[PDB]
Amino acid sequence: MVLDNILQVIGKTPVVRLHRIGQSLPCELYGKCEFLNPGGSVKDRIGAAMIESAEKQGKIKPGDTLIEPTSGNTGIGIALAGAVKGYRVIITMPEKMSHEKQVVLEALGATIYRTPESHISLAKRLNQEIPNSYILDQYSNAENPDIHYQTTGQEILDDMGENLSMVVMGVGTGGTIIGVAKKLKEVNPSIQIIGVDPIGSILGGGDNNLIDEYIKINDKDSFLMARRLIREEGLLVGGSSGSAVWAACQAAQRLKEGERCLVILPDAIRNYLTKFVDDAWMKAQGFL
Amino acid sequence: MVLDNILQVIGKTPVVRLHRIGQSLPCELYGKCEFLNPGGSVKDRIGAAMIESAEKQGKIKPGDTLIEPTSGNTGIGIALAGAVKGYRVIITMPEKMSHEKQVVLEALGATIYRTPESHISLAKRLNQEIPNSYILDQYSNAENPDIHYQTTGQEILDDMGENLSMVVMGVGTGGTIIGVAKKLKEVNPSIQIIGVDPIGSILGGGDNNLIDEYIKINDKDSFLMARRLIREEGLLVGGSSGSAVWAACQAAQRLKEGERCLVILPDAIRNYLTKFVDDAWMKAQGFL
Ligand code: NA
Ligand code: NA
Ligand code: NA
Ligand code: NA
């Protein structure tokens, strides 16, 4: 198909059967390939949607400065959509973020202000200092579950229908899981929504809950499963996809033959070529 | 959609209008996003097709060893499809290939034998030494234009039809351009087929031609255009996409208003995060 710009490519991600990873399970295991999005992550969706929603509400217009405070957990989504739509993008964050993420944000034209909640305070000060500027923060935004309710969740319903017993996805930022859970439980309340909570220093952060269970995953188990996804399924994913699939192999053990479990594969291999993808790094971290 | 494996995701790549890059041209400029393929390149297509064709001819079966001699110009396509389909993959090459490409090939389970035409001689020796082994070489294969005639070229016809005045694409390995040119000139013989020939040390190699013109592009011009594709169009491409778009801006200057030029964007940003994407590297190479 012919499109106006790359933002129109975001979404409608394919679902692939995980034939080798799912061998040890009685159920069928599937992976939704969010890492194939043009920015390389499920996070492409929220960035584009936040700009579209703020434009529709007349809060921003091209030429304006967008200020994105981040704890390094958010994607390149605001920078990507900002570059496409003609916004100046400023990002505030702690000095903790990787060279791989920083070089792409900068190539997309974003200005990064590194801080030693100083990054949130910096965004608020920049918002008052810079004329025609607006803060776009993925955290406490409240319209984050809506995009995943309107798109990601609808795609899962369109592709797999009511023949879906379990969905496994990450809990950070928090938009994906809440939006998808809300959409799926409206038509299938018996569906099991599994929250992926990485507790490691690398991948981790720092009555009727829509999220049925929260599984804790360390870094070793995430990276080893990510290596299985690349070697056994040809899925060029990052560590968070390994976290999600490891959690699914644990939770899906309860499911029966003919039942299906879907895992969101949120990140790409791009930022990890000098990390878990490298056997020397795996050995050095004591993961091999 | 729901699929059996990641190889079924290869192809049907979107065409996006290049609204900012095309401003200096009287014609409309478009980019076919081959870098969005699951292996990150147009080269995904040939790798999967070579294995499918050799399987159909009964020359190989899963469990067999596939030997891929390469001058580092070929993609991760054989390794990717080999991992998915259950083949042992051996790659022979000169010590010249990047850490980024090597780490992904190895993560996909390929064994790499580095040589100081020693890599072609090594493949031939391994073919005689290893039982149930078969050589899959992208060069001199002769069935390389067929896949691009059957798929890439057909997609261009399906998306843009006869309202297409020019197609710009790379000449290495040689399958893409010949296969696409043959398909397009059968329905539109007036179409202009522009061959992209990078002459730089980084991106370069070493009566009725289907290829109308061969444009030479140095490394500086390729990398600066690649930086424009990321910053102005949000296309997370590699240097060869910059080569192709730079060549299109030169050749398409002859086209008129309402005419359309399509450029194949063959590679992704993944292998270049410590290279052209980095301003420090651009400065060090004397490109800034
Ligand atoms: Na898409
Ligand atoms: Na002031
Ligand atoms: Na596709
Ligand atoms: Na021998």
Distance from C-alpha of A185 to C-alpha of B139, rounded to nearest angstrom: 53
Q: Over chain B, what HEC string results?
A: CEECCHHHHCCCCCEEECCCHHHHCCCEEEEECHHHCCCCECCHHHHHHHHHHHHHCCCCCCCCEEEEECCCCCCCHHHHHHHHHCCEEEEEEECCCCHHHHHHHHHCCCEEEEECCHHHHHHHHHHHHCCCEEECCCCCCCCHHHHHHHCHHHHHHHHHCCCCCEEEEECCCCHHHHHHHHHHHHHCCCCEEEEEEECCCCCCCCCCCCCCEEEEECHHHHHHHHHHHHHHHCCCECHHHHHHHHHHHHHHHHCCCCCEEEEECCEECHHHCCCCCCHHHHHHCCCC
Distance from CA of B188 to the nearest CA of A (A): 19
From residue A162, alpha-carbon distances to A87, A100, A263, B63, B257 in Å are 41, 39, 16, 37, 50
Cis (ω within 30 of 0) for the bond into A173? yes
Closest-approaching ligand to the CA atom of A6: 1
B8 touches chain A (CB under 8 A): yes
Which two tokens mark B11?
Answer: 């192809």
Q: How many Cβ contacts (< 8 angstroms) between chains A and B?
A: 155
Nearest to A108 among B107, B231, B279 (CB): B231
Residues closing a segment before a gap in chain A (C–N exceeding 2.5 Å): 116, 206
Question: Which residue out of A241, A273, A278 would a mutagenesis test of the B interface target, given it has the greatest number of B Cβ atoms within 10 Å?
Answer: A273
Distance from C-alpha of A141 to C-alpha of A43, rounded to nearest angstrom: 14
DSSP A200-253: STTTS-----S--EEEEE-HHHHHHHHHHHHHHH---B-HHHHHHHHHHHHHGG
Strands (E), chain A: 2-3, 15-17, 28-32, 65-69, 88-94, 111-115, 133-135, 166-170, 192-198, 213-217, 260-264
Which two tokens mark A126?
Answer: 């920049």
CA B129 to centroid of ligand 4, rounded, Å: 6
What are the boundaries of each domain within chain B? 1-36+152-288, 37-151
Choose among B148, B122, B144: nearest CA to B135.
B122
Q: Is the dihedral of CA A84, A90, A94, A99 positive or negative?
A: positive
A142 touches chain B (CB under 8 A): no
Give the side-chain half-sphere CA count within 13 A for B62: 6
CA A129 to centroid of ligand 2, rounded, Å: 6
Chain B residue nearest residue A98, CA to CA: B273
Choose among A270, A203, A194: nearest CA to A230.
A270
Give the CATH class of A1-36+152-288.
alpha beta
Chain A residue nearest residue B81, CA to CA: A234
Residues closing a segment before a gap in chain B (C–N exceeding 2.5 Å): 116, 206
Per the DSSP assignment, residues forming a β-bridge with B168 are B194, B263
Distance from C-alpha of B244 to C-alpha of B66, rounded to nearest angstrom: 31
B157 touches chain A (CB under 8 A): no
From the number of C-beta atoms within 10 Å of its C-beta (0-12, 13-18, 19+), residue B272 rates as: buried
Which two tokens mark A168?
Answer: 């496994």
Distance from C-alpha of B271 to C-alpha of B66, rounded to nearest angstrom: 24
A286 touches chain B (CB under 8 A): no
Q: In what order do the strands lie in the sheet with A133-135?
A: A111-115, A88-94, A65-69, A133-135
Choose among B65, B82, B63, B85: nearest CA to B4.
B85
Three-state DSSP class for residue A141 = coil
Determine, for residues B3 and A9 on separate chains, whether the beta-carbon distance falls below 8 Å.
Answer: no
CA B8 to centroid of ligand 1, rounded, Å: 14
From the number of C-beta atoms within 10 Å of its C-beta (0-12, 13-18, 19+), residue A95 rates as: exposed
From the number of C-beta atoms within 10 Å of its C-beta (0-12, 13-18, 19+), residue A4 rates as: exposed
Tally Cβ neighbours within 10 Å of residue B71.
18
From residue B246, alpha-carbon distances to B160, B195, B206, B284 in Å are 21, 12, 21, 22
**Active-site amino acid positions of A:** 43
Domains A1-36+152-288 and A37-151 share a fold: yes
Give chain B's radius of gyration (CA, Å). Answer: 19
Nearest to B277 among A103, A159, A231 (CB): A103
Three-state DSSP class for residue A71 = coil
Nearest to B5 among A9, A16, A277 (CB): A16
Tally Cβ neighbours within 10 Å of residue A179.
26
Per the DSSP assignment, residues forming a β-bridge with B134 are B66
Per the DSSP assignment, residues forming a β-bridge with A28 are A260
User: What is the separation of C-alpha A241 from the centre of its chain, rounded to a whole number of angstroms?
Assistant: 9
From the number of C-beta atoms within 10 Å of its C-beta (0-12, 13-18, 19+), residue B257 rates as: exposed
Choose among A224, A175, A220: nearest CA to A195.
A175
Which two tokens mark B44?
Answer: 């995904």
Determine, for residues B107 and A231 on separate chains, whether the beta-carbon distance falls below 8 Å.
Answer: yes
CATH topology for the B37-151 domain: Rossmann fold (3.40.50)
**Active-site amino acid positions of B:** 43
**Phi, psi for B209 (deg, rounded to 5):** -70, 135
A156 touches chain B (CB under 8 A): no
Closest-approaching ligand to the CA atom of B127: 4
Measured between beta carbons, the chain A residues lying within 8 angstroms of B108 are: 230-231, 234
Distance from CA of A34 to the nearest CA of B (A): 11
- For residue A261, which amino acid is it? C
Which two tokens mark B199?
Answer: 């002459």
Closest-approaching ligand to the CA atom of B130: 4
Measured between beta carbons, the chain B residues lying within 8 angstroms of A159 are: 1-2
Which two tokens mark B159?
Answer: 């998306």
A16 touches chain B (CB under 8 A): yes
Nearest to B100 among A15, A231, A273 (CB): A273
Cβ(A264)–Cβ(A168) below 8 Å: yes
Cβ(B158)–Cβ(B128) below 8 Å: no
Distance from C-alpha of A15 to C-alpha of A9, rounded to nearest angstrom: 16
- Containing A127, the helix (H) or strand (E) segment is helix A118-129
Choose among B39, B55, B33, B32: nearest CA to B7.
B39
Determine, for residues B103 and A235 on separate chains, whether the beta-carbon distance falls below 8 Å.
Answer: no
Query: Which residues, 6+ apart, have CB-to-CB distance to B143 below 8 Å?
Result: B49, B50, B53
Distance from C-alpha of B157 to C-alpha of B141, rounded to nearest angstrom: 25
Distance from C-alpha of A175 to C-alpha of B51, rounded to nearest angstrom: 41
Please report, to the nearest 10 degrees, the dihedral formed by the alpha carbons of residues A62, A84, A48, A50 taken in order. -20
Closest-approaching ligand to the CA atom of B131: 4
Q: Is the dihedral of CA B30, B36, B40, B43 positive or negative?
A: negative
Cβ(B204)–Cβ(B240) below 8 Å: no
CA B71 to centroid of ligand 4, rounded, Å: 25
Classify strands A260-264 and B2-3 as parallel, antiparallel or unpaired.
unpaired
Identify the DSSP state of A278.
Answer: S
Give chain A's radius of gyration (CA, Å). Answer: 19
Q: Is the dihedral of CA B133, B139, B141, B143 positive or negative?
A: positive
Nearest to A277 among B5, B6, B103 (CB): B103
- For residue B138, which amino acid is it? Q
- Diameter over CA atoms, chain B: 60
